[PDB]
Design a binder for this molecule. Structure first.
Ligand SMILES: C[C@@H]1COc2c1ccc1c2c(-c2ccc[nH]c2=O)c(C(=O)NS(C)(=O)=O)n1Cc1cc(F)ccc1F
Length: 563
């Protein structure tokens, strides 16, 4: 069937749309080539509609059915809990899209009678009605990139009331089931250092390793009605409260398999018969679907000792080499099996015989050295998008601060330390906002974090070595330097000068700022201060940080205040 059908009504914005990086003194201090930085808008939505609209041909076989039964037997061990209305309201982000039913995210979080009554009515409607398609809003996503222009991504989501109900029925399932089914292959259970460790250990565990990333073109559009029902069949293996079982059955048929599309103006926009990007099960379902197809495809291809690492549609495979000609043919057989499963490739996959040449979750393993000169593996990425987005966020107040999430997730990198930390600490110190909590995203879930708490967060996610790395690989240094020239970012010597300046001001303030000066900026001085384990690090409650993926699932993971 067709992934989408369209009526001709346009994908519309609900406010004015900015596409150009503003000319601002603070953002200009970071990046001078402002014309290279753009934000996607609804103006390019029709180009995306063309790309994501196609017919799906899916043919399942014995390997697919065998893997499914193996996944279902593991899913059978799960006991999932129904969330109370209050527990589900607390998982809602403070700036989540308001309901069209007279209330917003703040009313949900405060447990307002109007919010609570509506949610209860939405819940009882899911229990009673197993068929009526649930309305969704289709919007063009506003995302920042560097030129060489990508058309806007399309986001599809139901009303706030429905989103709270999804949490009640499925939050516990989507948080616990993926690891029970996929074990060590489920990427979202790993902190950055655990992911690098898993990748390095799997690579080294093979006699002669061969690895590859597999890029599925428009993954969400390739997801069929059968895939979505297969996904529910795995959910159905859980021990469930009867209402959770009914809500999952009703959500599958009324929302997950497809439904009508409405624009911001309230016009009938079209019909969806594929994955919605903005529902609770997108990350979980995409991971299960990708793992299922890839595991079955590996058996059909005759790839030897396949270890998958899956995060939604992002897939990496590390196996035992059978020889170069054999590996090349087995990879072509893997692609042919994935294509039959309705997962054709975007960029054709290529076998890799070096771990550092593989990009997975837009990241590659690199090596640096700690204070002792000992080799440390860490994950890095091309810094182009992080720097373009950090520049956008310096010029405009955004609900999500990708710069903060990038400092957290990429703390050991030369670019997060020298540029990102330097730039934002300079600005926040000058604005007396170092201790002001900001929202950022980790594996799609939102968190409220004070930049002054960064040293202890970093120590837990990466180890103390994140504050001591030096002698970065020449390939890594060159990619960073070339990106800076391309974007018109000041050279690293300027960043070292700015870091020495902010470090001195941070030390002068004492308290948490002096801790930031000591740990975050020790790289900027010859006279190194002593770096010991931070007392706050061991006390940090990082439960829920590296459990599951929640991209598009409208999940807020910071603590709720009492009432
Ligand atoms: C160890 C390295 C370092 O950082 C990561 C590592 C590994 C995986 C990571 C992140 C972050 C991440 C980066 C920065 C801020 N915050 C984050 O969470 C995400 C993420 O953004 N995931 S998501 C798509 O939003 O669910 N993923 C998963 C992911 C990333 C993709 F590029 C594509 C698909 C996919 F699954």
């Amino acid at each position: 069937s067709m992934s989408y059908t369209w009526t001709g009504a346009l994908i519309t914005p609900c406010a004015a749309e900015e596409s150009k990086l503003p000319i601002n003194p603070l953002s200009n201090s970071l990046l001078r080539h402002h014309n290279m930085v753009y934000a996607t808008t609804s103006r390019s939505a029709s180009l995306r509609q063309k790309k994501v609209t196609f017919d799906r041909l899916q043919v399942l076989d014995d390997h697919y059915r065998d893997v499914l039964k193996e996944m279902k037997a593991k899913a059978s061990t799960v006991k999932a809990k129904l969330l109370s209305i209050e527990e589900a309201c607390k998982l809602t982000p403070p700036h989540s899209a308001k309901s069209k039913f007279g209330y917003g995210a703040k009313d949900v979080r405060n447990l307002s009678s109007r919010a609570v009554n509506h949610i209860r009515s939405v819940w009882e409607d899911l229990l009673e009605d197993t068929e009526t398609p649930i309305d969704t809003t289709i919007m063009a996503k506003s995302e920042v990139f560097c030129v060489q222009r990508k058309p806007a991504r399309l986001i599809v989501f139901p009303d706030l009331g429905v989103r709270v109900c999804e949490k009640m029925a499925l939050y516990d399932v989507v948080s616990t089931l993926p690891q029970a089914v996929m074990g060590s292959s489920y990427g979202f259970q790993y902190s950055p250092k655990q992911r690098v460790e898993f990748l390095v250990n799997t690579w080294k565990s093979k006699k002669c390793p061969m690895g590859f990333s597999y890029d599925t073109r428009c993954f969400d559009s390739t997801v069929t009605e059968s895939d979505i029902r297969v996904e529910e069949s795995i959910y159905q293996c859980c021990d469930l409260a009867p209402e959770a079982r009914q809500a999952i059955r009703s959500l599958t048929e009324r929302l997950y398999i497809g439904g009508p599309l409405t624009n911001s103006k309230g016009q009938n926009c079209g019909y969806r018969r594929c994955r919605a990007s903005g529902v609770l099960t997108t990350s979980c379902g995409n991971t299960l679907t990708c793992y299922l197809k890839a595991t079955a495809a590996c058996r059909a291809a005759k790839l030897q000792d396949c270890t998958m690492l899956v995060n939604g549609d992002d897939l990496v495979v590390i196996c035992e080499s059978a020889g170069t000609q054999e590996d090349a043919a087995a990879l072509r057989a893997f692609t042919e099996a994935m294509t039959r499963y309705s997962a054709p490739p975007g960029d054709p996959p290529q076998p890799e015989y070096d771990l550092e040449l593989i990009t997975s979750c837009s990241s590659n393993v690199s090596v640096a050295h700690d204070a002792s000169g000992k080799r440390v593996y860490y994950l890095t990425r091309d810094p182009t998008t992080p720097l373009a987005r950090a520049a956008w966020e310096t010029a405009r107040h955004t609900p999500i601060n990708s710069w903060l999430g990038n400092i957290i997730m990429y703390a050991p990198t030369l670019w997060a330390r020298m540029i990102l930390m330097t730039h934002f600490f300079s600005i926040l110190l000058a604005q007396e906002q170092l201790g002001k909590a900001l929202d950022c995203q980790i594996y799609g879930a939102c968190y409220s974090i004070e930049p002054l708490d960064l040293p202890q967060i970093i120590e837990r996610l990466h180890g103390l070595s994140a504050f001591t790395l030096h002698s970065y690989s020449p390939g890594e240094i060159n990619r960073v330097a070339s990106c800076l020239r391309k974007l018109g970012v000041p050279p690293l010597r300027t960043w070292r000068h700015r870091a020495r300046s902010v470090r001195a001001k941070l030390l002068s303030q004492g308290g948490r700022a002096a801790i930031c000066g000591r740990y975050l900026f020790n790289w900027a001085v010859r006279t190194k201060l002593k770096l010991t384990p931070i007392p706050a690090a061991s006390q940090l409650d990082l439960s829920g940080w590296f459990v599951a993926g929640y991209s598009g699932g409208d999940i807020y993971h910071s603590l709720s205040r009492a009432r």
